[PDB]
C-alpha cells in the first residue's frame, strides 16, 4: 500500500485484475488481510471479512 495516515488510502483493489465470478449461489465471505513483509512467515496484522 501507500504511506498510511489517518485519512484512509485510495482504493487499493481498484485495478482490473481484482475480479471474481461465483459458480454457486449463497453467501461468500470475502476477506482482506494485512501483513508487513512479502514472505510467507510474515506476521499477520489485521483482517476484515
Amino acid at each position: 500500500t501507500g504511506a498510511l495516515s489517518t485519512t484512509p488510502t485510495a482504493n487499493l483493489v481498484s485495478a482490473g485484475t481484482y475480479t471474481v465470478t461465483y459458480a454457486s449461489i449463497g453467501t461468500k465471505f470475502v476477506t482482506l488481510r494485512l501483513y508487513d513483509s512479502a514472505v510467507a512467515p510474515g506476521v499477520l496484522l489485521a483482517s476484515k471479512t
Binding site: 498510511l4 484512509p8 470475502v30 482482506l32 494485512l34 496484522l45 489485521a46 483482517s47 476484515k48
Partner: peptide
C-alpha cells in the same frame, strides 16, 4: 493499529 474498510 489498523482500521480497514472493505
Amino acid at each position: 493499529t489498523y482500521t480497514l474498510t472493505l
